[PDB]
């Protein structure tokens, strides 16, 4: 399950580039998710009025939680596989105020990756997005298991 150096080194080298603009990643990270799995724009009561890619795109709203979330993320991946304290609130937020399947992070996660293949394709190589796979079931992971702690089966 855990990461070599070298593994989070390539998760971190894309990741550099998306710190560099986390609001506009995490708002194609959103859309894409909603859109590959409509369901789960069920989950969100302030965007489920959003009814197109474009209506998405111009959401001031959804740009700045794409940034919460991806802001968030970053903060556990650049943690690499010391992220227990960034993790857990986390967690804890979504078994218990926002009910969030493991299902779902893992649509979101492949959201994640093909939002970073399409806008970083030469920074993406396959061993980068096998790295970036792999942190992204290493955080799946590691949420479900608080999940359980919290009584929420994802
Ligand atoms: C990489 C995976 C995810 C990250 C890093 C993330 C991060 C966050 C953060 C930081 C917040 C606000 C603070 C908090 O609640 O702790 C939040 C809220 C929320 N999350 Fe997530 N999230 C992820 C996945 C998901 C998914 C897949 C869904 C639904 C399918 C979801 C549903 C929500 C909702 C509904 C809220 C509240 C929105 C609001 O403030 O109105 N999250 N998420």
Do not use: C
């Not at 150096?5 to 550099?16: A, C, K, T, Y």
């Not at 989950?43 to 919460?68: A, I, Q, V």
């Not at 990756?113 to 799946?140: C, S, W, Y």
């Amino acid at each position: 399950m855990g990461l070599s150096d070298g593994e989070w080194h390539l998760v971190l080298n894309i990741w550099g580039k998306v710190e560099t603009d986390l609001a506009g990643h995490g708002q194609e990270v959103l859309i894409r998710l909603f859109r590959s799995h409509p369901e789960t724009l069920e989950k969100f009561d302030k965007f489920k009025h959003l009814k197109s890619e474009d209506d998405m795109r111009r959401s001031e709203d959804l740009r700045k939680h794409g940034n919460t979330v991806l802001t968030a993320l970053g903060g556990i991946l650049k943690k690499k596989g010391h992220h227990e304290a960034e993790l857990k609130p986390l967690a804890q937020s979504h078994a218990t105020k926002h009910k969030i399947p493991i299902k779902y992070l893992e649509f979101i996660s492949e959201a994640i990756i093909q939002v970073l293949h399409n806008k970083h394709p030469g920074e993406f190589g396959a061993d980068t997005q096998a790295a970036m796979k792999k942190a992204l079931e290493l955080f799946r992971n590691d949420i479900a298991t608080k999940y359980k702690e919290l009584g929420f089966h994802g």
